[PDB]
């Protein structure tokens, strides 16, 4: 759900 | 005249933070993308891909950046990615001969004229628009890596983005942006006082000229031509019809 979102958490 | 201990304490920990950007990369088909002679379309979105990435690591290994909520990270990142992108666009941009220069990649160019594959009734207006916003930002200033590092700081913290709700976030982004002003501030007389309060105050007229252009960049691959194998990451920022 949302890569940026991804990329931010990971 | 020079500066203190601690101002250069914090130069050193921005030079850090962005040391990441112009780096060799490690993957072929990145690498690939960018020392190709032709740019498409969806080439130039596999581009963005790069920056935005290592835009986000940049952000992440940023001490100021994991003092937000997370719900605050996203909403810096989401709000003004198009604006670091720009900035960034401006840093290796080379006026006559129309390319872009990276220093991750020698011999390797893009076509100012890319836009003439984009959205068709407004790639002219974009084009005006980066040229502009590039002619605000003087030679002395655009090639001085701090001082470039320290303005996509203050754009990345702007405490008006959609989004930012908590008031803890805005807040703590209001005194990010703050201090990171003033200290471009004293860096600018620290090192050309001659002309640093002028160099200073023209600066937030080349932010409004950066907001303006970004804003109306968001659709320009409507109309561009078939893009679904370009990188994902761009089309959460540019619209697109497939
Ligand atoms: C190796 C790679 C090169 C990046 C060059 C990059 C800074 C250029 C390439 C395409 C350019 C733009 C495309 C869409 C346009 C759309 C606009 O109207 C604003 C400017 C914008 C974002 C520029 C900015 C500079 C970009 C991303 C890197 O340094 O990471």
Redesign the interface.
Same mark, same amino acid.
């Given at each position: 759900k949302? /890569?940026?979102?991804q /990329? /931010?958490?990971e | 005249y020079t500066l203190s201990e601690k101002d250069l304490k914090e130069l050193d920990s921005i030079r850090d933070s962005f040391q990441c950007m112009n780096e060799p990369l490690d993957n072929d088909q990145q690498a690939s993308t960018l020392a190709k002679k032709e740019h498409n379309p969806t080439d130039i979105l596999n581009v963005m891909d790069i920056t935005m990435r290592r835009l986000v690591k940049m952000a992440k290994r940023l001490g100021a950046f994991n003092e937000i909520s997370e719900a605050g990270k996203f909403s810096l990142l989401k709000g003004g990615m198009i604006e670091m992108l720009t900035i960034r666009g401006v840093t290796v941009f080379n006026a006559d001969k129309g390319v872009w220069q990276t220093p991750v990649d020698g011999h390797s160019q893009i076509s100012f004229n890319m836009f003439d594959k984009l959205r068709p009734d407004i790639k002219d207006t974009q084009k005006k628009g980066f040229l502009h916003f590039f002619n605000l930002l003087h030679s002395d200033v655009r090639k001085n890596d701090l001082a470039i590092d320290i303005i996509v700081l203050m754009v990345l913290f702007d405490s008006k983005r959609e989004g930012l709700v908590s008031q803890q976030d805005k807040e703590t982004v209001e005194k990010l942006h703050r201090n990171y002003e003033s200290l471009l501030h004293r860096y600018l007389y620290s090192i050309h006082k001659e002309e640093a309060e002028q160099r200073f105050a023209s600066i937030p007229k080349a932010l409004v000229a950066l907001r303006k252009v970004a804003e109306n960049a968001v659709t320009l691959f409507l109309g561009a031509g078939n893009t679904t194998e370009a990188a994902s990451l761009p089309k959460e920022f540019f619209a697109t019809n497939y």
């Open positions: 949302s /890569l940026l979102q /990329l /931010l958490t | -």
